[PDB]
Amino acid sequence: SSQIRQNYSTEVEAAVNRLVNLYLRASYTYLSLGFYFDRDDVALEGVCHFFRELAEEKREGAERLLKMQNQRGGRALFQDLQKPSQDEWGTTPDAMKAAIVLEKSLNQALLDLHALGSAQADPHLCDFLESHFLDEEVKLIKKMGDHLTNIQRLVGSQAGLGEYLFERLTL
Amino acid sequence: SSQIRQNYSTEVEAAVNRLVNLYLRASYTYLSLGFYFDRDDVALEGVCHFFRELAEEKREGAERLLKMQNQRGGRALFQDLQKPSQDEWGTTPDAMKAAIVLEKSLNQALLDLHALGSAQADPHLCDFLESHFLDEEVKLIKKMGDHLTNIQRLVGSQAGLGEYLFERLTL
Amino acid sequence: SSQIRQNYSTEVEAAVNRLVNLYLRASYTYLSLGFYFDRDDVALEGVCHFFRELAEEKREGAERLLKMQNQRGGRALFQDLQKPSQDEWGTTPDAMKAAIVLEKSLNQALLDLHALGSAQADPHLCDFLESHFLDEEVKLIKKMGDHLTNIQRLVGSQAGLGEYLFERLTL
Amino acid sequence: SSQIRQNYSTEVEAAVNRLVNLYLRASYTYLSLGFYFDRDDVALEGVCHFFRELAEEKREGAERLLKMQNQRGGRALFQDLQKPSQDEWGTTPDAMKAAIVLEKSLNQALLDLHALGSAQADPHLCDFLESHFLDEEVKLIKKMGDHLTNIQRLVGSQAGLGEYLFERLTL
């Protein structure tokens, strides 16, 4: 039951639960990315740290969504969390590309939810997504794109040397 | 006269004045709630303080609306302020229910104004209501709902004991 | 590949991956427990906080296992994470009982892994599990049992009052 | 003579003396590695420092073993210390490979002693080796493997440049 729910559609409630699942899936993907770079035969600790930090950020995003769900009087519903798409993540450019694909997918899900909110005349949702998720995603994706460009620039010269230098000097 | 008014409809100007009246009415209701709990035959000071704090918050909301009215070049117009709905407010659950009804009414008025702003293509109004009122209302209503649930849980056990414990340990 | 793996069986490597899955599942269960207690119709914030803290602890346990996996030259392998056993968690005693069942299951998995380590003559694993997991589990389970006893004592008197008092005064 | 010896076999006493010899041999090997990298025609000071630090660590390990020998009432017996396996240590990858081989040999000797302790029902020895040697070895070997992977990655690109960069930026 709820004694507080107001202007909060079942459609938005369901979409928020799905977004929680997507954020937790992303966190899990970043956990796997991080530990892959910590392998003794990979051993790029700046890259490991970068992804471990992202795993934390995505978990925090899920938690913020869940807090909002409860603030509005909706009910959190959890589903199975699928394992990440890969067991091994290839090179640093491969990994950074995968991360961009992942963030773009989260960003599109946020845009889809916003569109739903707007269609449902739910301005609290719009404002929530704006100042807490959409700007953060744009900033993160810019950072990732910058990183990808730098590593691509480096590995076009010499791959081993380039991966080492990027990890040491950027990350 | 105004030398600054831009994209600010007479409809929004009037709705803002009405919202000021609603916020000042709410402040007055909370003043009455607060002093009822300060009666020597009621004597629940945490409850008195909770409502007195809300009286302040609602007055501050009205003042923020008035400041915005002037920033946009609209003209504040004040109307009579009707007295609160009750002279005596019953039990703590009765009072908390009344507060939730009141906040939901303010929240609906904010949503109605936002809808008007959106219909009038007035994005300053949308942004103003978002970051200054709509989030605050959602947070407050969640707090009130939490409080109501706790007091209901307590007075289902033993009413006198429950009201005392809630006032001492939550408020 | 690995250039470091020594005295680390494929059996232990696989069991460690399974234990990671169990710890991440436990973290997910505690996330769901926490947010259930944050519902406006439940509203026991000390209970929410208790479970949210446990969600963090279990995630940290998984991360420690993964770090150890890599230290030994094993390879992390992630599987799907099943959703928690319940969507709604009942009363505080119901929830605390569920938590004890969960921790006992983790403890048994640790004991099973230790037995495997001992059978595989892997003293690093034994020492790792000892000073980092087994003592922590015993301490946590004692705390949970103490909590369950207190809430049972309280709700045998009066359920609503008891749940409120436990949340306010213990948690 | 001893007035304190209890549950301490002659087999374990002898094995501890042999382990002291192995640790002192390792210290000597690291001394030679360190000074090789300090040669004016090698001149990789981060590599020199890395190995000199290890020489200290291994000497400290021997001293801890000797202290334990006396704590248990066993008698330290010293043997000749053989010179290191090489006079010149080749490239940075050559040296790091040699270090890994050396640490694996110490780790295996620790495992062999632990197995003896367990067979002799000597839990003090097990606990001593656990919290003071086995974890330290696993951590060190992981670090070495990480280093080897990085230098291999670098010298696969360009050897001179790679050796310089590793010494400057990792060490």
Ligand SMILES: [Pd+2]
């Ligand atoms: Pd790492």
Ligand SMILES: [Pd+2]
């Ligand atoms: Pd890391």
Ligand SMILES: [Pd+2]
């Ligand atoms: Pd960081």
Ligand SMILES: [Pd+2]
């Ligand atoms: Pd919007």
Ligand SMILES: [Pd+2]
């Ligand atoms: Pd928006």
Ligand SMILES: [Pd+2]
């Ligand atoms: Pd917005």
Ligand SMILES: [Pd+2]
């Ligand atoms: Pd008062």
Ligand SMILES: [Pd+2]
């Ligand atoms: Pd007061």
Ligand SMILES: [Pd+2]
């Ligand atoms: Pd206050």
Ligand SMILES: [Pd+2]
């Ligand atoms: Pd809007």
Ligand SMILES: [Pd+2]
């Ligand atoms: Pd808005």
Ligand SMILES: [Pd+2]
């Ligand atoms: Pd806005």
Ligand SMILES: [Pd+2]
């Ligand atoms: Pd909470």
Ligand SMILES: [Pd+2]
């Ligand atoms: Pd909480």
Ligand SMILES: [Pd+2]
């Ligand atoms: Pd805490």
Ligand SMILES: [Pd+2]
């Ligand atoms: Pd053991």
